A paper describes a structure:
Pseudomonas aeruginosa CtpA is a carboxyl-terminal processing protease that partners with the outer membrane lipoprotein LbcA to degrade at least five cell wall-associated proteins, four of which are cell wall hydrolases. Instead, it requires the adaptor protein LbcA, the lipoprotein-binding partner of CtpA, for activity in vivo and in vitro. Therefore, it appears that LbcA interacts with CtpA to assemble an active proteolytic complex, which controls the activity of these enzymes by degrading them. We show that CtpA alone assembles as an inactive trimer of dimers and that LbcA is a right-handed spiral that might wrap around a substrate protein.
We were able to crystallize LbcA with its N-terminal 48 residues removed (ΔN48). The crystal structure was solved to 3.5-Å resolution by the SAD method with selenomethionine-derivatized LbcA(ΔN48) crystals. This structure contains only α-helices and connecting loops, with a total of 29 α-helices. We resolved all 11 predicted tetratricopeptide repeats, comprising 22 α-helices from helix 7 (H7) to H28. The 11 TPRs form a notched ring, with an outer diameter of about 6 nm and an inner diameter of about 3 nm. It is a right-handed spiral structure, because the first TPR is slightly above the ring, and the last TPR is below the ring. The first four α-helices at the N terminus form an elongated extension that partially caps the TPR ring. However, four LbcA(ΔN48) molecules formed an interlocked tetramer as a dimer of dimers in the crystal. The chamber of the TPR spiral of the first LbcA is occupied by the H1-H4 of a second LbcA molecule on the top and by the H2-H3 of a third LbcA molecule on the side. We suggest that this bundle may mimic a substrate and that the LbcA spiral may wrap around a substrate to target it to CtpA for degradation.
Residue numbers in the entry: 51 to 573
Write the structure that this text describes.
């Protein structure tokens, strides 16, 4: 281990902080200006000058002052921080490629190991803090979080077992319980949670975790009593009541969940989410009328689109597609802010219930209404590709990649279709390279990279890229691609063995079945 070897982790930390700063700037730019007090005073002043028809000339003069202009201060701070981070990153990439006595300069190695942004430095700082203040509950909780996220949960649990504060403090106890539940030994977590209520009776999260652990076992009857006790001690907590309704709804005890949801309706808190969950429960109860009447009264927000999708799905289950289209059009006319998302809902529902022609017609209608929506024509591309229509699929995909030269996924999609179907191999290499440079973390882009490398002739690079893409996430398509690429280079047993796992007797593995027949056909 040397200093140059340690600098990469520092660069990774700088990358994380740069990403966070840039995303922070992005969310700042969209956000409206905070009320503050100057705009509040101007609001009361406008409320005053509104009484007389004569213009409040002094109010207009003051409200248009040069100091009343939004300079976007925090956004500029975030941008400048991201810029200096990028500058330092560039500097230390320039320092990395240099050669020298990287070793035996122990002064800088200590600073490289004390960096809180590196995982090893995080752990070193946590160890130094536990040395300074031992048995600190929050420090143990943070170190256990670090160890569990690092991919070593059992070591974190063993660290928790050695500390006595893990039995007393609420957050370490909660983390130890959810860790023990993942080790398939949930019963060991039962007594500790009880002891927590002995130490923290008024703490609602501890009792909620106790109730969830009761639900985990078959002994759910006491969990209903725990719900009743929580409601008895804190009948005003609306978020706690919503969480109790959610856990009761997970344990398919529909009666108490419906009771809690109607109680939330009476208290006028989380009304749209409450009605959405009532609609889901009624859909489970096969009560189509109640589910529809509850989905219709879901207000706009983070639950309007799921309610619309569930309504469309129930309508398609009933077979009255005309009423489904009419309700979706009426909802589009009611709230046109994300009407494009309503069209996406319609397309998804029609594609998931075997109405290919109606899905294509709805997408055509949506594009006629919004010809510039970049999601709508991409959905048209996927529908045309499912319809074996490569022409429309190429036209709109070229359209979207020309209008947005920096749309990775669409840029990726066409490229993959270039490698898999046609023989325009030169464009596909550049297309997949650009998609990989835009977002290397995307595993479908890595799959496309292995596929174009395999069809281009480079067998080793294709195998490595497909191996990486398969390591990130298990997919049947990537599995078949890796199997075929490995089979072509040789090592038949390895390709045969890789196929054994991801077959899994899956109806989704219908495409995978054809890869085996194509290659075992030569036998």
């Amino acid at each position: 281990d040397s200093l140059y070897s340690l600098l990469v982790a520092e660069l990774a930390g700088q990358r994380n902080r740069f990403d966070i700063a840039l995303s922070n700037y992005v969310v700042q730019a969209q956000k409206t200006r905070d009320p503050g007090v100057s705009e509040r005073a101007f609001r009361i002043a406008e409320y005053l000058g509104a009484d007389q028809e004569a213009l409040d000339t002094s109010l207009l003069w003051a409200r248009s002052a040069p100091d009343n202009l939004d300079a976007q201060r925090a956004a500029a701070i975030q941008l400048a921080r991201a810029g200096r981070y990028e500058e330092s990153m560039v500097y230390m990439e320039k320092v990395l490629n240099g050669q020298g006595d990287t070793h035996f300069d122990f002064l800088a190695l200590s600073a490289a190991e004390t960096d809180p942004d590196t995982r090893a430095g995080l752990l070193q700082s946590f160890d130094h803090l536990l040395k300074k203040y031992p048995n600190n509950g929050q420090l143990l909780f943070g170190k256990a979080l670090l160890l569990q996220q690092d991919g070593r949960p059992d070591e974190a649990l063993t660290l928790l077992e050695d500390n006595s504060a893990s039995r007393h403090e609420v957050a370490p106890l909660l983390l130890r319980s959810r860790l023990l539940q993942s080790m398939k030994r949930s019963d060991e977590a039962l007594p500790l949670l009880k002891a927590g209520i002995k130490e923290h009776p008024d703490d609602k999260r501890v009792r909620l975790a106790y109730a969830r652990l009761l639900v985990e076992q078959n002994r759910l009857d006491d969990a209903k009593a725990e719900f009743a006790g929580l409601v008895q001690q804190f009948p005003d907590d609306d978020d706690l009541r919503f969480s109790l309704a959610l856990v009761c709804l997970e344990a398919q005890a529909w009666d108490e969940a419906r009771i809690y949801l109607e109680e939330l309706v009476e208290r006028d808190s989380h009304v749209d989410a409450a009605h959405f969950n009532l609609g889901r429960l009624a859909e489970e109860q096969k009560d189509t009328a109640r589910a529809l009447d509850e989905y219709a009264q879901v207000g706009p927000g983070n639950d309007f689109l799921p309610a619309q999708l569930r309504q469309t799905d129930v309508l398609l289950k009933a077979g009255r597609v005309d009423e489904a289209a009419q309700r979706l059009d009426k909802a589009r006319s009611e709230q046109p802010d994300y009407a494009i998302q309503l069209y996406l809902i319609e397309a998804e529902a029609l594609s998931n219930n075997d109405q290919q022609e109606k899905a294509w017609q709805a997408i055509q209608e949506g594009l006629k209404q919004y010809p510039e929506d970049l999601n709508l024509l991409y959905t048209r591309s996927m529908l045309a590709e499912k319809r074996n229509d490569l022409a429309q699929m190429e036209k709109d995909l070229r359209f979207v990649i020309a209008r947005e030269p920096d749309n990775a996924m669409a840029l990726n999609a066409l490229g993959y279709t270039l490698a898999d179907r046609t023989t325009r191999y030169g464009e596909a290499r550049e297309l997949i390279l650009k998609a990989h440079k835009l977002n290397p973390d995307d595993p479908a882009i890595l799959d496309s990279m292995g596929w174009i490398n395999y069809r281009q002739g480079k067998l080793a690079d294709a195998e490595r890229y497909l191996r990486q893409a398969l390591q990130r996430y298990p997919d049947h398509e990537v599995a078949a691609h890796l199997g075929e690429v490995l089979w072509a280079q040789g090592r038949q047993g390895d390709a045969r063995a890789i196929w054994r796992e991801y077959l899994d007797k899956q109806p989704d593995s219908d495409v995978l079945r054809r890869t085996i027949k194509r290659l075992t056909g030569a036998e």
